[model samples]
Target: PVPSRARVYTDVNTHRPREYWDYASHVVEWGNQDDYQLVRKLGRGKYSEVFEAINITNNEKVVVKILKPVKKNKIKREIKILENLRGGPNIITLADIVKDPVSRTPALVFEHVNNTDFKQLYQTLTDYDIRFYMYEILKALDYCHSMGIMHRDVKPHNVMIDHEHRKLRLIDWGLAEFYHPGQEYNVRVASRYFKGPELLVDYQMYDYSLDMWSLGCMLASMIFRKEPFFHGHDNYDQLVRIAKVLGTEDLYDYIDKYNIELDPRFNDILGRHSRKRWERFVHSENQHLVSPEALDFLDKLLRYDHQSRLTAREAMEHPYFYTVVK
Candidate 1:
């Protein structure tokens, strides 16, 4: 297969020094763990447990994320990526890093945001509110992509939204990777439902646009009122679910265009299916959120071809964000 470069921002890391993109050699300056005390348990993910911690130094609230047992290399990469993208628009800020001197466990201290759970939050969002917050996230995505990062996982759970304060922070850099033009990447990056066609089809040569597709999934779920826009049972079925809506014909076109070799397992699972337009997803329940502009923007992002998906920069200028962009 021929190497295909991303449609835009193909040279972000090309002009930079090696130290800029190389996270391996970054030396850690660990902070004092005693400075913060855990107040209460908030949540836990595959990699870490989070809590609302009180900083004894100033008596301020901060998130203390205790890294669960994992490879040392993975932890270093995440910390480095977080450091590189710090202070970007709507990007989560990593305040400090601390390690347990006795057990050698590590934890990350972060600027806390009073975020509402997305399950409850998306239900109450108005059309204008969706536009505003989505624009904020696109700003974060554009900033990171411009700085040579791809946030492979872009979903509601990773997006911490404090509606009252109008704050949006795109968190979780564990899955984020640096971009290099014409490089092959891991397909096992994003969560199941948000995984783009490129990942499912095993076209490992992907780029920052992958996040755009995941953002597209998030936007689809919000406006259409589907918790997850695509409800696939498994990774392979995930592509089938996408094909069911995007049509089997176009899936084939996308695969053939890239000369992607389909896994044999898909031979029986992927049957001919017709395309379903974004308009069909709108109902009385979601009609309040749906509009021509919203549908058009979704179409631009959820394309079968990864390169066809809108870049974060292009998405900000789309007509859907017209009211919020200017």
Candidate 2:
């Protein structure tokens, strides 16, 4: 990663491991003498960098997310969505938002959970434990959809686990969309691997169900630690993955019902797409890696037709969760 432009110094607390760096004292950029001082780099991505910071005044610690200027729109959207959010087990609680003085970039201040993401936690947990986590995620999704909000990016990277407290929190609302009834917005969202066929075909009709599709992809990934709808590079590959998993029977229906234009690139795959590919992709390979209850929960979220997909609320009430969740 390139160096930060704001000239913030990070001091190591040698008394503890790097992971224990004081979130309250490490300053990433030293433009202001604010109460929270950034300590060290937690991780850096293409669009943002997460840091451990300390609250000097109150001695509280936090995770400070510094995003690029281009993501200002996302920052604003996150604040709006988070402000409207009520209560959910998986949704991360937002604490504050601040603008970096020198870089003039936006930073989101979030409660510092003493744990890692679901990826790390899965290594030690059982299938039953994973189901409990998934149940919480579905509950959170149900809450968001009930409020007419759609989180376009629901992936493992965004799910945080407070292992110490046995809690799950969903972070990153940058791709969130508020779906108001009777309102039409151009569909320009969704992660490729988790995208529904409708998003691959016509995005205009995409709704809260898109999140359910993503949940399926995520659950499948957790079960096998690999993408169930494993698409190749680019849009063509993405469609092929969808075609293989969903088949033309379902894919062509959307094309006929919605009258959406098919990508000329996928014309060949469309003709050959079959139910064999659909069932094979979803049920074959490492499909048996998880319990039957887990697969039952996954099917509801992974339906080919977006409209028929399970809503977040219905998903939480599924029998699969009864084994452990409250």
TM-score of 1: 0.97
lDDT of each: 0.89, 0.66
Residue-level lDDT for 163 in candidate 2: 66
Which stretches in model 2 have alpha-carbon errors above 4 Å? 1-33, 117-120, 277-291
Best candidate (score: TM-score): 1
lDDT, residue 275, candidate 2: 54
Q: Which candidate number maximizes lDDT?
A: 1
TM-score (all chains, Cα) for each model = 0.97, 0.80
Runs off by more than 4 Å, candidate 1: 101-103
Candidate 2 residue-wise lDDT, 1-326, digit = tens: 11111011111123334323222332333333376689989978667888999877788998888887665455566666775573555677777777767667877777877766455666566667777887888878877765556788887778787766778887788788666443444556666777666666654646677778888887777676664445557656777766665567777776766666676767865566665522333445555456666666776677666666667777767777788745
Q: For each candidate in turn, give its C-alpha RMSD to the true structure in angstroms.
A: 1.3, 12.2
Scored against the true structure, residue 71 in model 1 reaches a CA lDDT of 80
